[PDB]
Design a protein around this nucleic acid. Structure first.
Ligand SMILES: CN(CCO)c1ccc(/C=C(\C#N)c2ccc(C#N)cc2)cc1
Ligand SMILES: [Mg+2]
Ligand SMILES: [Mg+2]
Ligand code: NA
Lengths: 224, 213
RNA sequence: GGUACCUACCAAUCGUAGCGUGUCGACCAGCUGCGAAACACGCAGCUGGCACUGGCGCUGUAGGUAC
């Protein structure tokens, strides 16, 4: 029952520093090579660093050599990646990965963590404003209505949007966040629904921005 | 540094099609090559190790082969769940190197978008900004043109588009175009229209509203 | 006088008076299997060097010893 759990991600300014941890369960990290691999939003995987067992020898990519340090503690089955002199181009999701056993899976990474987000920017954290996108009671066919929520002006990622506290999920489309010229993020979460239920069904959008500890609920209903 | 040039960068294939994805190492990496599959937002999953060995649990339709510096991942017959981004990796020497990735999406019949227009709520208007939203729902292929019009005035540079990933149930896309104006600029115009051009539309479809109705 | 042992026999070339021999092992480098193991480290096998170890076989020139 192997498992890797990352932690420590967050927002920091250029030139800042941050230490990520990767807690392993179901096996002892001292008997495997441990790797850190990053993925920038919408980009490919990039090997970041690695540490070998028994020797403790460490290896790093050219773009992080001298700034990052990989380490591991066994009396506390955990691995660590310290990042100093952080740049904007280091923003990404960071995954902890276990190299498999030499005689079973070669040098493939057989177990990965869920990843943790690291954002490097001089901008400041800010919660979103949640506005409604009301269904058009004016000009709407039977059984074809669309409503939604607009989550605007927040930073950094992510925001989560649910509908009816998790009950409504069929037909929901939550779009990827786009960065506005203001430097803040915005997205919309829409859902289609029969118009017959527009007046007899209350629709709630639950928006949540963890960095700002913001939790908002917005009712969406026709206008006038 | 050893580079891994992966091709193609993307492809749209129909269920049952055979897919081949190649990765060329800049120099020899022996057979220390692995292939991974990643679903959107999830962690990669090990498919193949040592260039050609099938990882435990991976269906037999996935296969890997080597010819010199060329490494190839083959999905003999593409299943609907094989939607994903596939990556190659060399672990012959440090630093390790990943390929740029190949995004495999699923083909399907053309589907026209359902177009909706949403004026800015009064709540937002009281803050000094106006967001007008145009939603294109459940269409295929991803290619679509959205054009904003304010009193028949062609807009440009004041809108942003965002597209979802292919829906796992019906394999369609959804797009949102947001037009941003100042409160004054908004309240000094009447007709707001979104014109959508898409392959499965014989002619462009326009959805519009008059401010205040 | 004979047999046996011992001491010495320019320089260079591992060594040797000289000829041949590259050894359990030591050292340098490489490859492979294995150790929870890409490097480092441990065990084992092999390959090429090296000649630390200066042994072994053959065979002299004298001097000496023993019989
Ligand atoms: C073919 N050749 C000529 C040049 O290549 C050789 C030269 C020298 C040797 C040395 C030895 C052998 N066997 C040797 C050395 C020291 C000890 C000890 N203690 C034991 C044996 C072998 C061959
Ligand atoms: Mg001499
Ligand atoms: Mg010597
Ligand atoms: Na030897």
């Amino acid at each position: 029952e192997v498992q890797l759990v990352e932690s420590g991600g967050g927002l920091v300014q250029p030139g800042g520093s941050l230490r990520l941890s990767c807690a392993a369960s179901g096996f002892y990290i001292s008997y495997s090579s441990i790797h850190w691999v990053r993925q920038a939003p919408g980009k490919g995987l990039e090997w970041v660093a690695s540490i070998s067992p028994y020797s403790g020898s460490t290896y790093y990519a050219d773009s992080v050599k001298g700034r990052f340090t990989i380490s591991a503690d066994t009396s506390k089955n955990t691995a660590y990646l310290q990042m100093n002199s952080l740049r904007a181009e280091d923003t990404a999701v960071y995954y902890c990965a276990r190299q498999g056993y030499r005689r079973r899976s070669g040098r493939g990474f057989d177990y990965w963590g869920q990843g943790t987000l690291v954002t490097v920017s001089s901008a400041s954290t800010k919660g979103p404003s949640v506005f409604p996108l009301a269904p058009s009671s004016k000009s709407t066919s039977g059984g074809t209505a669309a409503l939604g929520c607009l989550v605007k002006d927040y930073f950094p990622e992510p925001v989560t949007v649910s509908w009816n506290s998790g009950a409504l999920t069929s037909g929901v489309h939550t779009f990827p966040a786009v960065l506005q010229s203001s430097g803040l993020y915005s997205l919309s979460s829409v859902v289609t629904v029969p118009s017959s239920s527009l007046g007899t069904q209350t629709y709630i959008c639950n928006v949540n921005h963890k960095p700002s500890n913001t939790k908002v609920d917005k009712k969406v209903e026709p206008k006038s | 540094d050893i580079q891994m040039t992966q091709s193609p960068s993307s492809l749209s294939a129909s269920v049952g099609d055979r897919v081949t994805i190649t990765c060329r190492a800049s120099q020899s990496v022996s057979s220390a090559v692995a292939w991974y599959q990643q679903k959107p937002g999830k962690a990669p999953k090990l498919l193949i190790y040592s260039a050609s060995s099938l990882y435990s649990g991976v269906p037999s339709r996935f296969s890997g082969s080597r010819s010199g510096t060329d490494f190839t991942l083959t999905i003999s017959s593409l299943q609907p769940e094989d939607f994903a981004t596939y990556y190659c990796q060399q672990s012959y020497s440090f630093p390790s190197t990943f390929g740029q990735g190949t995004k495999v999406e699923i083909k399907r019949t053309v589907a026209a978008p359902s177009v909706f227009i949403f004026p800015p709520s009064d709540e937002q208007l009281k803050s000094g900004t106006a967001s007008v939203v145009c939603l294109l729902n459940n269409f295929y292929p991803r290619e679509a043109k959205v054009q904003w019009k304010v009193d028949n005035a062609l807009q440009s540079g004041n809108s942003q588009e965002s597209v979802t990933e292919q829906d796992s149930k019906d394999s369609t896309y959804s797009l949102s175009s947001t037009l941003t104006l100042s409160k004054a600029d908004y309240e000094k115009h009447k007709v707001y229209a979104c014109e959508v051009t898409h392959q499965g539309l014989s002619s462009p479809v326009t959805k519009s509203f008059n401010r205040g109705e």
